[PDB]
Amino acid sequence: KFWKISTPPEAYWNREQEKLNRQYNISHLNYCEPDLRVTSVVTGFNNLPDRFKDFLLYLRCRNYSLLIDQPDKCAKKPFLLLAIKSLTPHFARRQAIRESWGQESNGNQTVVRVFLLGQTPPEDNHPDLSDMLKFESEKHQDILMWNYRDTFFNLSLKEVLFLRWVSTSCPDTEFVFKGDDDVFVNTHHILNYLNSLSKTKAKDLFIGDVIHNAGPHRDKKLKYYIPEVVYSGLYPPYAGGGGFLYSGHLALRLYHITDQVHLYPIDDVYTGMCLQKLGLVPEKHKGFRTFDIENNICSYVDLMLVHSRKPQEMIDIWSQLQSAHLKC
Amino acid sequence: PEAYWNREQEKLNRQYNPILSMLISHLNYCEPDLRVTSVVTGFNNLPDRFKDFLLYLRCRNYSLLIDQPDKCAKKPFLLLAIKSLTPHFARRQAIRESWGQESNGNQTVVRVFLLGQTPPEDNHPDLSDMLKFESEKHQDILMWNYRDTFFNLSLKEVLFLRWVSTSCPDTEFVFKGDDDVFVNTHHILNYLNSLSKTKAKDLFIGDVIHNAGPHRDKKLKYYIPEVVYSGLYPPYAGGGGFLYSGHLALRLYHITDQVHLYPIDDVYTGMCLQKLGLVPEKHKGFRTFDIEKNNICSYVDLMLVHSRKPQEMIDIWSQLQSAHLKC
Numbered sequence: 299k300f301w302k303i304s305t306p307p308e309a310y311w312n313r314e315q316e317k318l319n320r321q322y323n324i325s326h327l328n329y330c331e332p333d334l335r336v337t338s339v340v341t342g343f344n345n346l347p348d349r350f351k352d353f354l355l356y357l358r359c360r361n362y363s364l365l366i367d368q369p370d371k372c373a374k375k376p377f378l379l380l381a382i383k384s385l386t387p388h389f390a391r392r393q394a395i396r397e398s399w400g401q402e403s404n405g406n407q408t409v410v411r412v413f414l415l416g417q418t419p420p421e422d423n424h425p426d427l428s429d430m431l432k433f434e435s436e437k438h439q440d441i442l443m444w445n446y447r448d449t450f451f452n453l454s455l456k457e458v459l460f461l462r463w464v465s466t467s468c469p470d471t472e473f474v475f476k477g478d479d480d481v482f483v484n485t486h487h488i489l490n491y492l493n494s495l496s497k498t499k500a501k502d503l504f505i506g507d508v509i510h511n512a513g514p515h516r517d518k519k520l521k522y523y524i525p526e527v528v529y530s531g532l533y534p535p536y537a538g539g540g541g542f543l544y545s546g547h548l549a550l551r552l553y554h555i556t557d558q559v560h561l562y563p564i565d566d567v568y569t570g571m572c573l574q575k576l577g578l579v580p581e582k583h584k585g586f587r588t589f590d591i592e593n594n595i596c597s598y599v600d601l602m603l604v605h606s607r608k609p610q611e612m613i614d615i616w617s618q619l620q621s622a623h624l625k626c
Numbered sequence: 627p628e629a630y631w632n633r634e635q636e637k638l639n640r641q642y643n644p645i646l647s648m649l650i651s652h653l654n655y656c657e658p659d660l661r662v663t664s665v666v667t668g669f670n671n672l673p674d675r676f677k678d679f680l681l682y683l684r685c686r687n688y689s690l691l692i693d694q695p696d697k698c699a700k701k702p703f704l705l706l707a708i709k710s711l712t713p714h715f716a717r718r719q720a721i722r723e724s725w726g727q728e729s730n731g732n733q734t735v736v737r738v739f740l741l742g743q744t745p746p747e748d749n750h751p752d753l754s755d756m757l758k759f760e761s762e763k764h765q766d767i768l769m770w771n772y773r774d775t776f777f778n779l780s781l782k783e784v785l786f787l788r789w790v791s792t793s794c795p796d797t798e799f800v801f802k803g804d805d806d807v808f809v810n811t812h813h814i815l816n817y818l819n820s821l822s823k824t825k826a827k828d829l830f831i832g833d834v835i836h837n838a839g840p841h842r843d844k845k846l847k848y849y850i851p852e853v854v855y856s857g858l859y860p861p862y863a864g865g866g867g868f869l870y871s872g873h874l875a876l877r878l879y880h881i882t883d884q885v886h887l888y889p890i891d892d893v894y895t896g897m898c899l900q901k902l903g904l905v906p907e908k909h910k911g912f913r914t915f916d917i918e919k920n921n922i923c924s925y926v927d928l929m930l931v932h933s934r935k936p937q938e939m940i941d942i943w944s945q946l947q948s949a950h951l952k953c
């Protein structure tokens with residue numbers, strides 16, 4: 299017996315995910331009243347931070363409604379769909395993107411853009427910016443908003459509901475980029491990389507800054523902290539950072555398999571789990587510079603995205619980039 | 627006088643002295659003052675903010691792009707003037723809900739936000755259509771035509787003091803602060819009512835700094851090189867806010883025409899106060915220091931605390947509305 303250090307608990311996620319695999323080889327998808335069982339099953343439940351309590355309690359609900367929609371966003375077959383994760387108060391970040399690399403363009407290559415939002419509700423001491431979000435939505439017509447609590451641990455929900463929106467409203471798009479609103483993207487380089495793709499490599503395309511043999515952080519005071527009570531083992535290969543790039547074909551496969559993967563607090567890992575269940579490994583690509591602080595305008599020519607750029611820098615870097623095929 | 631600001635201010639004092647004058651181009655000259663390139667040593671190596679500052683110093687003829695004329699139609703006991711930048715939409719809205727609430731008995735409290743321009747030529751995102759929507763909805767945006775930069779915050783003060791002079795002269799008091807500062811508006815109105823009519827008409831309190839001089843480390847945000855300013859700073863109320871009388875505000879605006887703008891706004895206010903022969907009064911309640919204990923009691927007897935995020939402001943205000951029981 300383990301009298302020294304306590305027995306390592308069986309994690310609630312792994313236990314429920316194997317339970318879910320047998321079911322497949324809907325009480326986990328639309329059950330939206332609190333699942334109070336976890337308060338007994340999960341050891342040490344009442345000391346877990348509040349985000350962990352909410353995640354476990356509402357993990358089996360994902361049929362949230364679309365409050366703001368852009369139905370005609372793909373009335374023309376998109377070659378590339380830009381899906382930017384954003385929060386309600388980030389009006390500056392979103393507008394810089396509309397003016398820089400997030401520009402919608404059109405010849406046979408139509409590029410369209412949407413911003414993915416939840417709610418920042420008053421119960422969480424957020425300022426009421428809803429009427430402003432509507433005005434922004436009527437003006438630019440690129441706001442998607444569902445009625446879930448847009449929190450860090452609900453980002454898997456943001457993934458699934460976006461994928462569901464793809465399947466139900468933009469399934470014809472040839473390609474899909476998804477990422478953060480504080481990243482700079484060389485949409486020129488992307489469209490070039492996309493147009494250089496063999497139809498073979500294009501069908502199952504998924505590329506980004508893939509991290510292998512990673513594990514949940516157990517340091518309680520860290521952002522990406524997951525205790526062994528929640529998840530045990532190592533993460534699958536997953537493309538993290540502020541963006542990855544994939545085909546619309548794989549997007550439909552990703553959506554269908556989401557029903558078979560329980561939500562996970564780290565969204566970029568969840569998309570890797572779905573990739574695993576489909577039999578695929580994300581493709582690491584050197585142009586996905588997760589790291590790089592900051593001139594050197596030639597560097598931005600060679601890359602696909604750099605992480606952490608302020609709204610002014612996004613428009614500055616994109617302005618220089620326009621004539622960059624002379625300075626480099 | 628080797629340093630430029632001292633020298634031109636000396637030229638400015640002589641101009642305004644009745645004797646020394648006898649042997650508006652410092653207010654309305656809105657072409658670049660190219661003379662600073664020949665006179666300020668090493669001008670070409672000064673950072674761009676110092677360049678634009680020295681070149682356009684002699685201009686403050688900047689018009690109001692968005693006005694709230696009826697803001698002070700009802701005489702206010704306290705005017706809330708908050709310095710803000712265009713994209714700070716969440717900062718302002720959180721204040722509107724927490725401590726910047728406007729209320730009508732005699733102690734009417736009103737609130738304005740003081741904005742310049744974040745123009746596209748500086749690679750800013752165009753949020754004008756959004757800012758105008760905010761003004762229609764909340765009737766509290768004041769926007770002038772000038773580059774809202776750090777070294778231009780003295781301009782924000784002079785133009786605002788002008789706006790008080792024309793459009794809100796009868797306010798009894800004025801709070802002036804940042805948009806990332808929590809202000810116990812309740813404790814403010816209490817303190818203000820505890821004031822004799824003596825201390826209440828030359829009132830100007832805050833986190834006052836004495837014995838202060840310019841930072842000379844080229845890396846600091848508040849760096850000021852010896853070619854620009856030599857000597858100590860006066861007593862000035864630094865930090866994220868201060869509070870004063872509307873009467874003193876009218877005096878301050880009249881004395882701005884005789885003080886060259888300074889790249890640090892907190893210092894420019896004290897310089898105007900020194901020309902009025904007054905001294906800002908230090909106050910314990912202006913804690914630009916406490917930044918996160920977690921007892922709501924720490925907010926009951928403070929005027930102002932810096933800095934807070936927009937969620938933090940709304941949360942602090944709610945716990946404050948019920949701290950009479952707990953504390």
Ligand SMILES: *[C@@H]1O[C@H](CO)[C@@H](O[C@@H]2O[C@H](CO)[C@@H](O[C@@H]3O[C@H](CO[C@H]4O[C@H](CO)[C@@H](O)[C@H](O)[C@@H]4O)[C@@H](O)[C@H](O[C@H]4O[C@H](CO)[C@@H](O)[C@H](O)[C@@H]4O)[C@@H]3O)[C@H](O)[C@H]2NC(C)=O)[C@H](O)[C@H]1NC(C)=O
Pocket residue numbers: 330331332349350352353356359421445446447448449450451452
């Ligand atoms: C991801 O996003 C989802 C979508 O919003 C979030 O899910 C919500 O989570 C919140 C909690 O953060 C849930 O709100 C809570 O619901 C509890 C149960 O509600 C039932 O009971 C009430 C009253 O009995 C009925 O009116 C109602 O119809 C339901 O039948 C309440 O007990 C909670 O009350 C809490 O707040 C009050 C004050 O507001 C306190 O006084 C209480 O003590 C208590 O603490 C609260 O209302 C909400 O139900 C969930 N929504 C859905 C659709 O499921 C996830 O939280 C989020 N995940 C993460 C990790 O952020």
Ligand SMILES: *[C@@H]1O[C@H](CO)[C@@H](O[C@@H]2O[C@H](CO)[C@@H](O[C@@H]3O[C@H](CO[C@H]4O[C@H](CO)[C@@H](O)[C@H](O)[C@@H]4O)[C@@H](O)[C@H](O[C@H]4O[C@H](CO)[C@@H](O)[C@H](O)[C@@H]4O)[C@@H]3O)[C@H](O)[C@H]2NC(C)=O)[C@H](O)[C@H]1NC(C)=O
Pocket residue numbers: 656657658675676678679682685771772773774775776777778781
């Ligand atoms: C505080 O806020 C004020 C108010 O906005 C700022 O003052 C403005 O500062 C900008 C520069 O930052 C000034 O704009 C510059 O004006 C120069 C002078 O233009 C006159 O002269 C030329 C030559 O005869 C004429 O062509 C022109 O029509 C004017 O008659 C311009 O030369 C500058 O042009 C720059 O941009 C071009 C691109 O268009 C570049 O290619 C050039 O190389 C050049 O760098 C520039 O437009 C503006 O005039 C100021 N406004 C006022 C009212 O004075 C302060 O800068 C700000 N202070 C701080 C510290 O931020």
Ligand SMILES: CC(C)Cn1c(=O)[nH]c2ccc(C(=O)O)cc21
Pocket residue numbers: 383384385414448449450451453456478479480
């Ligand atoms: C680029 C971000 C805008 C992504 N994001 C998003 O869409 N919703 C989010 C909620 C919380 C956090 C966090 O890390 O705190 C981050 C979030």
Ligand SMILES: CC(C)Cn1c(=O)[nH]c2ccc(C(=O)O)cc21
Pocket residue numbers: 709710711740774775776777779804805
């Ligand atoms: C809203 C506050 C942040 C104060 N502020 C303001 O009103 N206008 C400003 C321009 C620049 C800077 C800076 O710190 O660089 C700060 C500014």
Ligand SMILES: *[C@@H]1O[C@H](CO)[C@@H](O)[C@H](O)[C@H]1NC(C)=O
Pocket residue numbers: 328329330361362363
């Ligand atoms: C999800 O579906 C169930 C089943 O009809 C329903 O009761 C519940 O309200 C739905 N949840 C949301 C958030 O709409």
Ligand SMILES: [Cl-]
Pocket residue numbers: 387713714715716717718
């Ligand atoms: Cl903000």
